[PDB]
Design a protein around this ligand. Sequence first.
Ligand SMILES: CC(=O)/C(=C/c1cccs1)C(=O)Nc1ccc(S(N)(=O)=O)cc1
Ligand SMILES: [Cl-]
Ligand SMILES: [Zn+2]
Length: 259
Amino acid sequence: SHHWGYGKHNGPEHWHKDFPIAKGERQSPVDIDTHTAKYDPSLKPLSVSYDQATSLRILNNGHAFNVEFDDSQDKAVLKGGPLDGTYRLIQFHFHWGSLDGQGSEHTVDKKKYAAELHLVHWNTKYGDFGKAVQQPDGLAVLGIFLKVGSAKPGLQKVVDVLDSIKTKGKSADFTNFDPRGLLPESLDYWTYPGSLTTPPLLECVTWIVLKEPISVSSEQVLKFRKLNFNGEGEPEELMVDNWRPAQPLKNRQIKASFK
Ligand SMILES: CC(=O)/C(=C/c1cccs1)C(=O)Nc1ccc(S(N)(=O)=O)cc1
Ligand SMILES: [Cl-]
Ligand SMILES: [Zn+2]
């Protein structure tokens, strides 16, 4: 079994030894250079259809926390933009920092945000998530930057349950959560082909990164930083800086949905 994490001893600089694809041709995240991303008129409109989303549970997995959805039917889907066909929402999670000047995985002209939200979707033509991650177009991850300012009211139900999943392996019931409350006003985005940003680092993701960040309060992100990487009863290791740094772009072009 693997023992990867975000520390000096097991952090992103080490991952390549158990996961050689870490040094691959389409790794994530990347720096988005706004002055070399080109507007693409071929991109179709982005369609976020979360009206029927059914959240079930929230889990501390020792790396982040996942809010899990019922993906047994097309209840919450992402379509359009660069995507062919229908991608089903399975979970969302965040990456965040020890301080407000770091935490995001993607950067914008080398700017790091306080955190980044990932809404993870799988291509329904592959029938299940485990099959989809074996395909170069298997997943679509919608990435949203968080900056510290005004509170995000639609985030507070997540903040308030974190006390109940402090340590690795803890879960709580988390029904009737509406992920539409986490979106910014604008769906303007950048898109590029990439990877999972954690082991197993599979090159199966179409990244869609929204240009407009959402604002959350200092108090909201301080509550993320009280989570633990460790299990119950173990020495406390605060769950902070669970982000992978920007990886080489190599032979890829980032496309913008907007002028
Ligand atoms: C157990 C579990 O949670 C997962 C299992 C998998 C099993 C096989 C491939 S993944 C999973 O979904 N991993 C994941 C999802 C999104 C991102 S990211 N930061 O690129 O959005 C990173 C990791
Ligand atoms: Cl900004
Ligand atoms: Zn992620």
